[PDB]
Write a protein that binds this ligand. Sequence first.
Ligand SMILES: *C(#N)C1([N]C(=O)[C]([C][Si]([C])([C])[C])[N]C(=O)N2[C][C]O[C][C]2)[C][C]S(=O)(=O)[C][C]1
Length: 218
Amino acid sequence: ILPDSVDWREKGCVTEVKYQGSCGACWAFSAVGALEAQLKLKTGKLVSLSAQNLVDCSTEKYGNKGCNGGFMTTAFQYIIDNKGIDSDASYPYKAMDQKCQYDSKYRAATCSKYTELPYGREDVLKEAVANKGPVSVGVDARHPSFFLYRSGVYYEPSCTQNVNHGVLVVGYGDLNGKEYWLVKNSWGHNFGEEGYIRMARNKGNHCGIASFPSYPEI
Ligand SMILES: *C(#N)C1([N]C(=O)[C]([C][Si]([C])([C])[C])[N]C(=O)N2[C][C]O[C][C]2)[C][C]S(=O)(=O)[C][C]1
């Protein structure tokens, strides 16, 4: 039995909304966001993790291209292999590709593994968000409506399952009969509902939100 609605922000596991700027680091922010929640659950401290650390270090060997794109899963594996990721405070985001400057003396979190959910199963995604924590996902944000989104439950007739933008599901619920996923974006606090966007849930894997979900564990 799963709760009808969930919002991890109420549980203190979600940091402030970040602004990626002109650097395509959505994948990095999605990844640190998921781990930030696990760090809170494990240690009791809420700490923004270094997305820059990922942009700069989880590079070619992980199939990532810094400001030109990357994967949340391989980002998680990097943290695992690297035996750590620095805090955002010690390794600030500059919205540009830099030489890897990771240092274990600034480590703020570790990762032991990650789990990729089965393709397109929103019911499995719901279970993971309710019982595990925020889940990193990819969505189709290629449409004008996404950029122009301001409030309510987002539904785009032209959306596809071909995802291109990494975000973080921090909860779910329903708005007057319209079910949705509560999504934390990395386009600053001025985008959508102060950094967040509620996307159609249980509407045939709308915009591929349940296409490639994954979450890390400490
Ligand atoms: C973000 N910001 C952009 N996207 C990505 O990083 C996506 C994330 Si997913 C589809 C959920 C794995 N990844 C890529 O675009 N990759 C291409 C390069 O190799 C790694 C994966 C940044 C790139 S973008 O401007 O094309 C869209 C937004």
